[PDB]
Design a protein around this nucleic acid. Structure first.
Ligand SMILES: [Mg+2]
Ligand SMILES: [Mg+2]
Ligand SMILES: [Mg+2]
Ligand SMILES: [Zn+2]
Lengths: 38, 349, 141
RNA sequence: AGCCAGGAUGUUGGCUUAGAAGCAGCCAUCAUUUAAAGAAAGCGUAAUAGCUCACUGGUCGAGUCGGCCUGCGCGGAAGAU
């Protein structure tokens, strides 16, 4: 997990999901692409 | 071909062992050996096709021999002459398959005294003529004259193409045997001169004052300052992490001034520590290139009474001293390279 | 039909066995023998010419016995001795590599008309010249 | 958007280099069969291979797809009795 003030899509598998009032990125291909806004 | 023929003949089988190791599948799991084979594919397929041409010439030589009763001498005479010509052409074209920059030529007097200075002047004139008949520029960086004749020590800078590739074999000592000009009797005397050849290098001096690798401490100073000096951080200390050089300053009452001048001192005294290293490196290199001119360690001898010049590295003597002293020393430096390069391809193991 | 298993068409001109990297480790990683190409592969090379770059199927099993079927030389190397140019482009618009007559290509297309797909023979001309334009080959009117 | 099917042909290209083949970097970016398919957008080889996408056919079957201007909110947001 990488925590940064600007989460963005990096590949074509990345998805934007808002869980519990937090915006975060997850993709099913590259585990290095998961990130949350903080 | 003294041994390059033997070098290739021993290595000609390696030109097939590389192919053998190509198709074994035991050198394919790794990469280094296969890379070596691919780079050394049998005499480099361009030169390999050249070798096929030479073998066609050799096969043409092989025929037209088993018949008699004909005055046939001239055609196979010219045929074998052409074969030798193309053989030497193959030699040079596969020997062609770095350090080609300006040079510093330094020559000084060895044993002999004034006669050594005279011979140094003559030798420098020879090199200057060889350079001027090459479209090269020679400039006298420094001179120390020799009282009667030439120079105690002349150092000049030669600018051109491939200068160091041709002049790098002139280092060492040169011996001269002749009747000197500073001699009342007719006695023959032996003297020596010492010659060094150097390349030129970039001399960047990067001020690594990059603060990403500095450790800085601020603290109180010591002395007579009353109540202000106690409660203030007016002393600075900077350590440069890559080199371990430490400098501190507390001379003034202002932290900013101390930091500025301490940083300046750090820069100066980190630049000196590199200039000294470069100086000692170049001095050491000059020392082991120069030798100690004492007419016992030498590379070539000039006998004026016999008009002969001999080279002891390759054991080659010639009777063309006058043409050499007028600046046609090319015939001396061609064979040496011929030997020297012949070892560069051999040292691949 | 069995699809590609262990064979990729890649090797130098058919002229001889030439036990070089293009042939040795082309099969060395897959098996068989390097020297075998002088008898079976080169049986038909005496028919055509010495120095024709053609790709040959190198189907090899785990049995280390291989069968080979060739094809026509690729159009790039095909129109080299027929065009007199040994080099090729890479800057075919800044300059050009030579000249070629339009009539010189269709009379060799029937060699490749069997293994190339198209409505008729004349259709093969357009495919080559479009490729030929990439080599800087200027059509001679 | 899903769900089935296809997703083709001479570049083993000179151009660089040992090896570069759509996918390392220098140019060009045509043509054929076709309903479609890029002389290659992505993953993947020392080099091949191999793996997706575009695009095109069948079921489904009612809506669906992105910019512009604006109101109020979300994160970015850590200190000492
Ligand atoms: Mg939770
Ligand atoms: Mg005082
Ligand atoms: Mg806010
Ligand atoms: Zn992703």
């Amino acid at each position: 997990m990488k925590v940064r003030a600007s989460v963005k899509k990096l590949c074509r598998n990345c998805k934007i999901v808002k869980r519990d009032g937090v915006i975060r990125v997850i993709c099913s291909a590259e585990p290095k692409h998961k990130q949350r806004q903080g | 071909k003294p041994s390059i023929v033997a070098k290739l003949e021993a290595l000609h089988e390696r030109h097939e062992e590389v192919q053998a190791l190509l198709g074994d599948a035991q050198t394919i799991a790794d990469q280094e050996r296969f890379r070596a084979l691919s780079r050394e594919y049998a005499q480099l397929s361009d030169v390999s096709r050249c070798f096929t041409d030479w073998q066609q010439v050799q096969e043409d030589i092989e025929t037209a021999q088993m018949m008699l009763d004909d005055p046939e001498m001239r055609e196979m005479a010219q045929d074998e002459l052409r074969e030798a010509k193309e053989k030497s052409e193959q030699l040079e074209q596969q020997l062609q398959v770095d350090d080609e920059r300006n040079a510093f030529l330094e020559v000084r007097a060895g044993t002999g005294g004034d006669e050594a200075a005279l011979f140094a002047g003559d030798l420098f004139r020879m090199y200057s003529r060889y350079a001027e008949a090459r479209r090269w520029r020679v400039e006298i960086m420094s001179a120390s004259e020799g009282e009667h004749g030439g120079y105690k020590e002349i150092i000049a800078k030669i600018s051109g193409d491939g200068v160091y590739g041709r002049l790098k074999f002139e280092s060492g000592g040169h011996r001269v045997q002749r009747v000197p000009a500073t001699e009342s009797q007719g006695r023959i005397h032996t003297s020596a001169c010492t010659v060094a050849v150097m390349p030129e290098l970039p001399d960047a001096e990067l001020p690594d004052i990059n603060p990403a690798d500095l450790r800085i401490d601020t603290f109180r100073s010591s002395g007579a300052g009353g109540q202000h000096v106690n409660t203030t951080d007016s002393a600075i200390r900077i350590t440069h992490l890559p080199t371990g050089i430490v400098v501190e300053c507390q001379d003034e009452r202002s932290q900013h001034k101390n930091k500025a001048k301490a940083l300046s001192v750090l820069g100066a005294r980190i630049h000196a520590a590199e200039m000294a290293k470069r100086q000692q490196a170049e001095a050491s290199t000059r020392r082991n290139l120069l030798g100690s001119g004492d007419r016992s360690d030498r590379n070539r001898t000039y006998n004026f009474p016999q008009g002969r010049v001999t080279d002891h590295r390759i054991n080659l003597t010639l009777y063309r001293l006058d043409e050499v002293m007028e600046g046609k020393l090319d015939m001396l430096i061609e064979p040496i390279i011929q030997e020297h390069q012949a070892d560069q391809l051999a040292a691949l193991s | 039909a069995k699809k590609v298993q262990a064979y990729v068409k890649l090797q130098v001109a058919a002229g001889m066995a030439n036990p070089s990297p293009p042939v040795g480790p082309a099969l060395g990683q897959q098996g068989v023998n390097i020297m075998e190409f002088c008898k079976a592969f080169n049986a038909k090379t005496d028919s055509i010419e010495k120095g024709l770059p053609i790709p040959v199927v190198i189907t090899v099993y785990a049995d280390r016995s291989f069968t080979f079927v060739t094809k026509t030389p690729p159009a790039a190397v095909l129109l080299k001795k027929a065009a007199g140019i040994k080099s090729g482009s890479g800057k075919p618009n800044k300059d050009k590599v030579g000249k070629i007559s339009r009539a010189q290509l269709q009379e060799i297309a029937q060699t490749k008309a069997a293994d190339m797909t198209g409505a008729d023979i004349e259709a093969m001309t357009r495919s080559i010249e479009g490729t030929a334009r990439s080599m800087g080959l200027v059509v001679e009117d």
